[PDB]
Point group: D2
Chain length 303, copies 4
């Protein structure tokens, strides 16, 4: 009954397990949706697409021409698909609007601990049995001050975790959540947060207001050899500015989760870790995405 | 006069030394020492019988096996490492294994962003089991708490091992090595545990039945294994979710400093703990 | 023409070559399947690689979509069901062979790489580790090298080896003049196995060949021997090899495939080879 | 009594030693000259007078600043093939079961033109190897070698050599005339995508000069052997392969080195 596109095995794995409850007819394609590949959908009420797959108008028309009713998104971001045209074509479109907050918080910390301890580098040594420890010197988080920017669900989840480490908590949101407050987080202005903090992590949405929020001016406030981990949108961090910092040694480590050769130079010459939008890649996180995306499909059958 | 020195060892001893103002001689080789009242040695230096006027011997580590014990020589050591750092390391291996970050870097540094096979699990729901209630275990135990995990331990909610083994979906052991301990984790254990379980040991090797583990891994009883190691390695790491790290647990500036301090005072000394 | 399982190289060289031919090209990254086949509509011709499905339904589907001709860009046609193709009046064409020289060259570079542990070095080096332990090699000059199969590839390898200053033995049931001229000496395997310190296989997969290298072969072979295999995998009894590898009768092993070096059927992946393939492939289509 | 021992040093000396019948893993410095209480040293170990003197109180290589022609030549090619074919990049892909070939395309040496700079024994040995490949051979030495001429080599204008060759390997010694022999001036001349391997002394290549050239995309690949972060960037973002003065690291060369040393 449904055909899925840009499938990766993890998609296949958890849509299926999930579908057990739904009992849909699932057909998986591993290639990008396009005008040219639009045909494949035939006999399919519904289609499932990730961020890369093409929603441009033509694709949509073509999808109609094949009797497709419903379009679903395995991800919150619906930038690819042109909604107006969809309406004109009477194609419902659906999505999953949030990811388990816990996963992104967890990932972020994981990059943090990995960077902190150069575990990623150890492996590269270890696997070939080079046990030399030079350059893997880390730091202990206990004493330190942790600065989190944004206090949404994810941001808080990160905070609980950080609190675990015995870290002292500073956060920067306009609005301060109780939930954050019961933790002991103390809200401060950025400049304060920048100087005070030896670990910074951003869990906030991009607004024109905070684009390039972390920029050269920001950097020179912050401590030397600071750790910055960003699982939020790319724009929040100013790449060029960041890079200068790394080289001139303001930033100890940087962790980036890349929404969809700087990498090679950066990764190789620095404590930079890059991960390709891995944040929600947990079984739980995937299962939820499926329940949501299938359920959405169910609902279409009756309101 | 310090032996088996590595740059970090050198770094933290020097910084700490500023308060002490001892005179430091650094050697990069194993265990020559004329003009030195005392010596500093790591785990691998040799302190048996056969081994110029050196009054005292100091250990840069908790363990005194390499050395022996009459010749008018006093021996001191550091019996603790920052509990937190090691605890901190233990998780970090865990997260790295969980999220397969170690393998992502492998891809990423060459700009491959495929995510297949990096899928992990979310710790928030999960039960967690700790072995050892020592400073380290507790320290780890807190960290785990932050995760929202549910804690069982053995030496929170204390329980017998079997109870722990079946219940726990993550395990970490932070206890010293005892005759009772040895190969504490063995086939009997592994076949108790949840399939896919993740085990991390920063504590001594003997806690785990090595061949026993491997069977388990092949058997797919164990999801991931983390070992801090005081061609199996290549094999294991390569064809499994195995991360071996070379006794890094206390490699952090704070800990290294703590070690140097405790070591340097020990030498200042009154008496102290040998 | 629509091309399937296009990988960039496939794409790059086909186009350059095209400039000569003027076909209209539509490149699809995905596998050709019964389901995919629709994608071909309006296309007289189709281009495919070893993975793609030539099995009948696909073919039927293809005709249904007006595909006059199917073109393959690799010697082997195991995937396509020829007769059925015949029934449906679809012409099927192929590329008979690859640059011989290119594949032979791979084998050698692969050999040297293993021999000198350059692969391992690079791992170290990229991190600015220059330690050399465990990277020791052996000098090929003076060594005896044995080649099995002396087809074009073998001969082309035989020359390369000859340059190194090695001694040459080869096993083919039906010898080659060319090989002889180089002064290679033909032998039976046993002699070859026992004698050679380097072995390279350049022969097709025949039932007689299967698992040509089996424990029987290995335990003849000199200790520390190096074997490089660009021919189909089945020439080698992997299980024996592993044993042999742990057992240490095998110094190094190199395999080309879809101290060990593995590479994914990369042998003919050179710009010269791909162009020649493209050109041959288009030409097939010109006809 | 040996210093700066590495397993290879030890194994081969011991083996060779049996005929002669005469080990320290650490550096020889003044501090260290007590252990001697007729010594073996490598380039790194300390040759300062003081150490010597402390020596009186109580080399395994050509360079005294403090090999088999065939081996180095062989390495040089192996370096060449690896780059050309990006095997090094594969193993990394392969070891973790990634079988994609994107970006590993190579070129077929056969019929290409190969240029050797220097025709020492090393130069020739390479030339021979290259002959096997079916390459067309050009060389540049001020003094023509007889042997090379027999191979069929045609000697040339450096400029000629630079423009014609799709492969260049340098097997000559450092001289005032050739220092920075390969400079921006050179690289500009050369074919785009050219491959360069230098096992010869480092200085023959204008390091910054290359780097631009690489960015500039004049040079397809560069192989360097380092006689005792730039390393990472280049290795990482470019087709460059660095090997640490491995050139003569073979059982055979090492054995030769050992025997000669015991004989000395």
């Amino acid at each position: 009954k449904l055909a899925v596109y840009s499938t990766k095995q993890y998609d296949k794995k958890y849509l299926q397990q999930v579908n057990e409850s739904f009992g849909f007819e699932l057909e998986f394609f591993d290639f990008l949706l396009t005008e040219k590949t639009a045909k494949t959908a035939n006999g399919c009420e519904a289609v499932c697409i990730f961020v890369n797959d093409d929603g441009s108008r033509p694709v949509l028309e073509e999808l109609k021409k094949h009797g497709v009713k419903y379009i679903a998104l395995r991800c919150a971001g619906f930038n690819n698909v042109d909604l107006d045209a969809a309406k004109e074509l009477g194609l419902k479109v659906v999505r999953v609007p949030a990811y388990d907050p816990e996963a992104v918080a967890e990932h972020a910390i994981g990059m943090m601990m990995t960077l902190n301890r150069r575990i990623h580098r150890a492996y590269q040594r270890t696997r070939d049995a080079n046990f030399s420890l030079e350059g893997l010197t880390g730091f202990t988080m206990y004493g330190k001050t942790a600065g989190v920017i944004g206090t949404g669900k994810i941001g808080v989840a990160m905070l609980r975790i950080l609190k675990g480490f015995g870290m002292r908590l500073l956060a920067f949101d306009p609005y301060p959540s109780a939930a954050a407050l019961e933790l002991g987080v103390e809200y401060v202005d950025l400049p304060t947060l920048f100087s005070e903090s030896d670990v910074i992590s951003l869990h906030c949405p991009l607004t024109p207001e905070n684009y390039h929020l972390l920029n050269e001016a920001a950097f020179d406030q912050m401590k030397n050899g600071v750790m910055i981990v960003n699982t939020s949108r790319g724009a929040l961090i100013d790449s060029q500015a960041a890079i200068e910092a790394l080289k001139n040694q303001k930033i100890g480590s940087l962790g980036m989760d890349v929404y969809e050769d700087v990498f090679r130079r950066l990764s190789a010459c620095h404590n930079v870790l890059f991960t390709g939008h891995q944040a929600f890649l947990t079984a739980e996180a995937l299962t939820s995405i499926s329940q949501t995306t299938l359920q959405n499909l169910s609902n279409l059958e009756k309101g």
